[PDB]
Symmetry: C2
Amino acid sequence: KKDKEIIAEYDTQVKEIRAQLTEQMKCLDQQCELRVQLLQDLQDFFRKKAEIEMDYSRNLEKLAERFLAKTQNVLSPVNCWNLLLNQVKRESRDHTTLSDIYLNNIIPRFVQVSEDSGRLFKKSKEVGQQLQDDLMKVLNELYSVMKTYHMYNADSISAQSKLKEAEKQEVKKIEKMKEKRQAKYTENKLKAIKARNEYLLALEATNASVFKYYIHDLSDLIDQCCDLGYHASLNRALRTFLSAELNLEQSKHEGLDAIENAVENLDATSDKQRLMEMYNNVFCPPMKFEFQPHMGDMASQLCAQQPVQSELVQRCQQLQSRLSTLKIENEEVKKTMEATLQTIQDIVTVEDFDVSDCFQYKPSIAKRRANQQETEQFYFTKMKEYLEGRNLITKLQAKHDLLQKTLGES
Amino acid sequence: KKDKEIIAEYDTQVKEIRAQLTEQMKCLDQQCELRVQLLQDLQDFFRKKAEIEMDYSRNLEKLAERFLAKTQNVLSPVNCWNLLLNQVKRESRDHTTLSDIYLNNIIPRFVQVSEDSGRLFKKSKEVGQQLQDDLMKVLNELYSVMKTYHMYNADSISAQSKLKEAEKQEVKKIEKMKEKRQAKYTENKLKAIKARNEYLLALEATNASVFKYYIHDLSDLIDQCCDLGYHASLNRALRTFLSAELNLEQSKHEGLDAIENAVENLDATSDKQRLMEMYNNVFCPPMKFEFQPHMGDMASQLCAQQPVQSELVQRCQQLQSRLSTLKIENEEVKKTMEATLQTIQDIVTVEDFDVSDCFQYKPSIAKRRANQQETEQFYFTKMKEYLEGRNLITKLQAKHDLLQKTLGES
């Protein structure tokens, strides 16, 4: 194994590490450029998004303002409508708020983490550079130390060969010449030892220097970015996003809950009561018509004297025969009416409102609607009958009862 | 109390009711126009809103698509970014869905309830009309019945006055003339009774007819709108709104939860590990430098023979004096470093993310940021010191330890 061959193997191992150290600097540089591109993207994204939310908000504000400008007791369906407009006005405010946060809060942070990543990469490239220059020293320091040993070993091999002949040539003066060869060898074999020890100690230093870079110093260099507050500053910026999103959610929920309440109080009878107590001079029953005596009449009740008692009994009895027969027919019409009205209520209260299938990634309607229209049509027929019937029954029952009180039965 | 005076009081009471009945028809007509105006508003509102959501959705779709088009192991911060783009793409889909529902579902219902309200008001005006015509009959029927009584009472007063004189004039034929006056009075006082009884019975009918309108028929007429499915059809339409809003809420929540997860796994060390195991040919430690024997050298360890043992002990002892003093200085620099790094971490992990005050209806930042920059600056000074120190300690400890193993101590 030759001098120049030993030195070439080591030259290669050193060119390998010199190569590798450059790659690590490229890779560390590429990773910074990725960090900086991402904070640029995050800026662009939140800038656009601010704009998007602001437009949305403005359309919403005009949508409410258009219907609020189209303007005592409030009827249930108007109250839903009012709260449906307040919900819109409120979502508008919220999305403006989300715009102010993207612009005055979230983006400033991305700008800052950008400037910092740049600054702190210069400071890290400097540390990277220092650490690589110091590994390059130690590696090049070994070349010379190897040479010195290689040299003082060539001397200690050459002087032990010439001493092989300084004894083989052994009349008195030849001994004087060969004892200076032993004074040269015991000088040169010491030189070899002293140089070999410096090399064994040089290897110890080289290997230790290499290992602390590769195992410890590299690793600490790579984390240096995220360790100084990259991840932690991201984390705050994103949670500001999530914060803002959660408050919108909550604000929206409070709004829609006021709508659900008002829908649940959709109530016809309360609305009726409120209609009547608004306009009382319109729905208030009049004073009943009183008997109005002519020429100062003395009596003012039914007179069932003679011979009229027999006619009044005839009348009363004939009213009662009709009343009994008419009421039974009327109650039959009333039954149909109510059963028909019921059928309508079952069509109009179908639970068809839940639309969750639509977020999940028939023409027979017209046939049913014709049937509905025909049912309503028939309902009103029977109502008009019912009412025509009830109106006679009302006057006959009235007359009959005045007679019955007056005459009796048996 | 006169004939024409009794008839005028009743005429008035009847003009009062005739008036009132007209008002009720106006009020019922006005209420329909309000129903129809509201379903027009609700149509206009949900038509516009569909448009608004569709625009918003389109801006959102392009916002994501712009960054997804800007495109092995994914580093924590990119993963947040990817999920932040998916959240946007998903809100876009959802708002399109909400547009389809407003247009293909909610508005069709309002259109239908509109057509129905119109149809069923014609049918109700007809019932209103019937009921008012029948109350008008009964009221006018009483005029004549009052007159008939008023008449046959004028006859029964006049024939009882002329019988006062038919007895006061009472020689034989005058009795024959006055007994036909008693035959006229007992005919006319019967006529009065028969007419008065028809009037007392007419009042009974009138009052009963009036009361069933005012108390029962009016009330049932006013509800007739909301009873046939107005409120119930509103209710379904609004709950379709609330349904759709709840699924958006839910879909959005699932999205933002994937962001919160990815923010919570922002992790520098995992990212480091993933960086290194991507590019292993770059971070892998090299083969340690071996002792390379020259000319086939026999020994290959430290030679601590004579006289070199005394020099090697001198060296070892002097390395150890420096090592002890340098390490203690280095550990001091290390301490400052770490305490300075800690200070940085406390600045970068301030919990400032919660923005709820902003949905609720300082310039000293630059001073703190200068202080941060100066701390980072000082951190890196001490690091460069620390490292310069550690690099000598590494080679001295290496050499020393090879000596110590070889020689001993005592």
